[PDB]
Amino acid sequence: MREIVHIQAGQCGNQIGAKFWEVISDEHGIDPTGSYHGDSDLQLERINVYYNEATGNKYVPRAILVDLEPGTMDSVRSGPFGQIFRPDNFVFGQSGAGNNWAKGHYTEGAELVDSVLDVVRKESESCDCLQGFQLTHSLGGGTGSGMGTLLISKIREEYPDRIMNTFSVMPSPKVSDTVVEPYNATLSVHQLVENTDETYCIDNEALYDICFRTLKLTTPTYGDLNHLVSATMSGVTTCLRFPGQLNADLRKLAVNMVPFPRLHFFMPGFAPLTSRGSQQYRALTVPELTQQMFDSKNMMAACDPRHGRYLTVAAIFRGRMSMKEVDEQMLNVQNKNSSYFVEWIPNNVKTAVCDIPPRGLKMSATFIGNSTAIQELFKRISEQFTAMFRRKAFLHWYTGEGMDEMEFTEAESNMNDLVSEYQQYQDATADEQ
Amino acid sequence: MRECISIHVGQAGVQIGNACWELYCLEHGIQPDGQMPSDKTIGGGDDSFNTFFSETGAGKHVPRAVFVDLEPTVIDEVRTGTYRQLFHPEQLITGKEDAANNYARGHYTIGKEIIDLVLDRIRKLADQCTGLQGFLVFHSFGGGTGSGFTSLLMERLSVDYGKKSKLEFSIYPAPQVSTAVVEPYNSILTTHTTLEHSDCAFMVDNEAIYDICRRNLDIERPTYTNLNRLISQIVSSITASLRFDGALNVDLTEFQTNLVPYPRIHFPLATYAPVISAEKAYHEQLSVAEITNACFEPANQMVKCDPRHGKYMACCLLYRGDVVPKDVNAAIATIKTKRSIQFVDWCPTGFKVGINYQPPTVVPGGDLAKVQRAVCMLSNTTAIAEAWARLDHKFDLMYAKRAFVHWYVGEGMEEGEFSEAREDMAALEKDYEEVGVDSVEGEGEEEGEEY
Amino acid sequence: LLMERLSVDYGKKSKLEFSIYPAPQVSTAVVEPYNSILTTHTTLEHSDCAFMVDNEAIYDICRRNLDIERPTYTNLNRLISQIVSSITASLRFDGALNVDLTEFQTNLVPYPRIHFPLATYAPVISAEKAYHEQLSVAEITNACFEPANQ
Amino acid sequence: MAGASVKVAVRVRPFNSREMSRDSKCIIQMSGSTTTIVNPKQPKETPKSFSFDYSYWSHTSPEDINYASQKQVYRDIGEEMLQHAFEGYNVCIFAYGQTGAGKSYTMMGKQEKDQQGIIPQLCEDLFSRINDTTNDNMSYSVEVSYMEIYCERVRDLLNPKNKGNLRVREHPLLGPYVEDLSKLAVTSYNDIQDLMDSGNKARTVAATNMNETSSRSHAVFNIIFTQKRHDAETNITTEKVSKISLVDLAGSERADSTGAKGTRLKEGANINKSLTTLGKVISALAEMDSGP
Ligand SMILES: CC(=O)O[C@H]1C(=O)[C@@]2(C)[C@H]([C@H](OC(=O)c3ccccc3)[C@]3(O)C[C@H](OC(=O)[C@H](O)[C@@H](NC(=O)c4ccccc4)c4ccccc4)C(C)=C1C3(C)C)[C@]1(OC(C)=O)CO[C@@H]1C[C@@H]2O
Ligand SMILES: Nc1nc2c(ncn2[C@@H]2O[C@H](COP(=O)(O)OP(=O)(O)OP(=O)(O)O)[C@@H](O)[C@H]2O)c(=O)[nH]1
Ligand SMILES: Nc1ncnc2c1ncn2[C@@H]1O[C@H](COP(=O)(O)OP(=O)(O)NP(=O)(O)O)[C@@H](O)[C@H]1O
Ligand SMILES: Nc1nc2c(ncn2[C@@H]2O[C@H](COP(=O)(O)OP(=O)(O)O)[C@@H](O)[C@H]2O)c(=O)[nH]1
Ligand SMILES: [Mg+2]
């Protein structure tokens, strides 16, 4: 029994968590009231991964919602899936951080962290055999970045053998909805590099690009982006819940994807995408899934994988398919694009197959890539961060909450080392000198 | 609970408060008598938003406002107007003379004996709030009361509460048109206190509003009511983030964290893009890109200064109505590629975005057309220094001969304050000059693995 | 671990293996070689006779002989099951010449450390192609030595 | 910068009381710079063999030929490294071994103070050389600190307070360091002995099948060394500063040897991770030295 505890902090994390729970509830046939009205038998076989059982055959998820302003909690409660959650898990304060990292991690969050940790311990002790945690949040904001990093630190200190994940929305190159974003992104990445086993990098720009170009939507909204991210999140942990011909837990993905401890920043992806009104033209087969999956324009990280090399790749398929087709297609992808795969790993494509595909898709697949191109994101942040730190743009708001300038420098150094470490395994030969 | 306290000092302050409270009662469906029939008909709701209004047991709603002025006439008007029953009868009006366009009279001589009552009533209002956000102070530079009394108030509130944000809306003397002879003195004097004690002072000129009204609204004879209505619309746009749901909400702390680089630079400009008459409301799309572009134009600026002569340090955009994020994204991308808009090299990001679902309302008897989309821009830039520099010259021309100085000294002030003041205004301009310069060269870029 | 404990406890009884070795080209894991190399010690010391098979070879056999272009693990497992049944058939049913499990070891391993033989099954043929052919003894014996059928 | 000249040495100790009591046999044999070892259970195939830059035979105590005397190993390592330290550059000693092999011995020496390990010879030459060299126109300063690494957490030994975790940091110019790490000055080697004993009493130790007392954590004993010059001028300046790091590594661990569960396996896992990282960096430094 592999139980996952789900946490979500900040406006972005709360919205994504709401959409994710709506999706998973559809997958397992749970009504908004909490009762079960499904059709197949396998849906209840592993419901205990995400849900707890109440008295009258009613199920309640393991969500824990955190914020420092009551607006988003009120929005989520007054919603289609408001009443499914447990009331005692809605932890919140007032007078939120306000895009200020110091308020979130050193001043305001220090009061709410004890209550949040108490609820987390209560929920965790009741599980049969906890596997890992989750956390949805955004790095460009105060409450999200600050409280999320603090929670990650404390939980990692308390439970050191379980698997910590996180789905983080990085700042975008061009589209910007805050001005003090680089400070929050840097002072945070500094903690995520230390206290996490896997991080999946999401960016608004890539998701907007997918919606505008692939799905052909004329008016994308945040619901769609949450949809995409939620589809990926559901796809990642499929093998814990349903049977298959080759299983892969979170820990197997962790072992196979990460060569060294500090290189765990992944580019996620999902296929297929017919954009509607074009399903009749596209024939759905395993080669088509593999073709769309590796395309540079399908990624949600806003990094071009052609500018680097793939350290490792993982593909989780969901459906009824032949194993020979999967193995041959992965071999062909490796051979035809040999320039973009590192040479000192003889084979760097993990594969898994599950038997139960999604609601209305004969077949589906999800992608977890690990390549050096992700370094560009960090580099871009540094190229902004120093530009604001040489002349101390907005620093007094941070030092007013008790944070010595040294903390800022101790970080720009850490991220710069991360970029350098990735840059080492990037050149496509190493000899002579 | 997101509450905030409104203060109105001086004649300009109380007329702006009149327009403001008219607008807010219209937004919340509250009758001028204080009753709300919407809840009675529906049977219950959150329409009695606790931000501006406190709800009593009988169902009446009283505003979280404190009017103050030394002239009984301007508030005897509202004690016998339409909204006579909306306000609590304790209004804190002095039955004496006025500052008479004298900072010294309003600060030292007559400012006492009325200060105490104002702090007790502000204390009583503050005690009723749970998680107060801050103060919105309305007043006008140049007036004796609105300068001196506002300075004394600002000092006492800073001493007492301290950590609460205290925003300010003010009316600056225009370059050319003026209504008094001693405006520069009272300005140069209250700048010293508005620099230290305020946290973010919004700045508005009358001539800019006259030009905006003449050009866009096609009103050839505007009066103070239209100006107050525009200012009220701006304040509504600022505060709507913590009254209605939205996709991206912007609280009052985010304002200051995102718009104030250094502690002494907190003087942004304000603009409202879709200002247009009902007749011209047709024949136009009023898409998001159009209003976003119209915000940046020099003509629509609400203070008589050219943005093209400075550099933008920060921008806050606050949208209302049918707005989706992708249109704002595209508009920002389009603005960033224009060369006439220069951003400083130490702010690569530049922008803050906030979206609200509640569209703007239309006041009966007004002039603004009903629109589906609206936006308010708050830009922190270096051009503002020019608007200061002009006034200073006049004060020096007034000071070199020591004209009209015996009136100020007779009320209890000394000459060195006039002197000390000029120095303070003199520096602030220096700081605004330094922040606008580009980075030097970095002082680096050395060789390395040359082997 | 299990083979170690069984070798300690029982000792003299035979122990045979049927294992899936990694394929030269295709694989479903990146850390396979470490596991295989670490396993080879216990495969060597404790087991008495180990047979090895490869998924790639069985895929090729299925494609060429049975004309299944998209096989799955079920077909491979069925083939391995046939192999094991032919191994153990001599213990169950009557025959002219019977071979016990110990006879395999006595006749097949020269020295203790070289007990790694390959296995093959000759008449793998589809129902449609079951006709047009005699499938005599000589034909199947010849097919067993074909390098393509390994 | 200087070439990463790493010196690899190995040393064999004699028998202990328990080994002498049993009918044990010696298996390490040395020749030149090569050492070979055999299997008692597999005496047919071959001995295994290794080569190191230094092989030291302190097996036979009364032996006169090719005996690795403590003064000999000190001349090999400590004298040259103290000479390097006095040039103003940093020095690091790593002591490794498993309970019995004989680590402490090489680091400290016997209790009768007749045959001295690396620490007393180094410290006494440092103190004595200075005491018999300092003049009016120079000043010397020496300080000592002592910390331990346990489960990737830094703990202080000299300070007797409640053993809370400390927080590593990174001063931009001076590099990594630890906050609130007690630092004390010393005058002679008796002071260092007192501080070293006091700190060693505070180290975490647990019992296992191999030994009743086994190191569960690494230790670092840092000696801060500063030289100041008084030239014939009003400008008095520090010539340079150097650090000597004497480091005790916990032995490699295997559940095939420590069968304890719970915290004991976790400590062993963290120890093995740290050892692997240390070997990874050390080999890379030697490669860096070798290439150009
Ligand atoms: C062919 C058909 O029947 O219609 C499809 C469809 O046209 C496509 C375009 C769907 C459609 O998705 C979108 O339009 C979309 C919009 C914004 C963001 C993301 C997707 C679909 O909505 C999505 C929907 O997918 C599902 O129902 C899956 O089970 C999916 N779950 C959800 O979408 C879901 C959302 C909220 C609540 C509950 C479920 C899923 C996939 C993997 C793992 C878990 C769940 C399906 C089949 C389709 C429509 C309806 C058009 C796609 O989405 C998924 C996840 O299947 C977009 O890319 C795929 C490819 C499909 O062909
Ligand atoms: N925009 C706008 N400005 C106003 C309004 N009423 C007054 N003012 C400004 O206020 C200035 C006069 O100073 P006041 O603020 O009225 O000073 P006061 O309130 O009369 O206080 P005393 O001078 O002591 O009597 C004029 O120059 C106007 O520009 C108004 O209704 N709208
Ligand atoms: N080369 C040597 N010559 C003589 N005696 C030695 C030698 N090496 C060790 N000894 C002694 O023999 C014993 C072995 O050292 P010991 O204190 O058991 O070290 P250890 O337990 O191997 N240290 P560690 O590896 O950190 O756990 C001690 O009494 C030493 O003084
Ligand atoms: N993908 C996604 N991103 C969002 C959403 N809402 C906000 N964001 C991003 O989050 C950033 C602001 O983070 P915010 O939610 O305010 O952080 P918080 O205040 O600590 O909760 C913006 O730059 C947005 O790009 C959403 O619904 N989906
Ligand atoms: Mg007046």
Author numbering:
A (entry chain I): 1 to 433
B (entry chain S): 1 to 451
C (entry chain E): 152 to 301
D (entry chain N): 1 to 292
Which sentences did the original study use to describe this structure?
KIF1A, a key member of the kinesin-3 family, is recognized for its high processivity and fast MT plus-end-directed motility. These attributes are crucial for the long-distance transport of cargoes in neurons. Here, we present 2.7-3.5 Å resolution structures of dimeric microtubule-bound KIF1A, including the pathogenic P305L mutant, across various nucleotide states.
To advance structure-based drug development, we determined high-resolution structures of KIF1A harboring the KAND-associated P305L mutation in complex with MTs, using the same nucleotide conditions as those for MT-bound WT KIF1A. The KIF1A-P305L mutant, like its WT counterpart, exhibits classes with both one- and two-heads-bound configurations in the presence of AMP-PNP: the leading head in an open conformation and the trailing head in a closed conformation with nucleotide bound to both heads (MT-KIF1AP305L-ANP-TL1). P305 is a key component of the MT-binding interface, located within the highly conserved loop-12 motif, (PYRD/E), which forms a 310-helix in various kinesins, including KIF1A90. A notable divergence in the P305L mutant is the reorientation of F303 due to clash with the introduced leucine residue. Unexpectedly, the P305L mutation primarily influences the orientation of F303, rather than the adjacent highly conserved 310-helix region of loop-12, which was previously shown to be critical for KIF1A-MT binding. On the other hand, the five best AF2 models of WT KIF1A more closely resemble the MT-bound structures in this area.
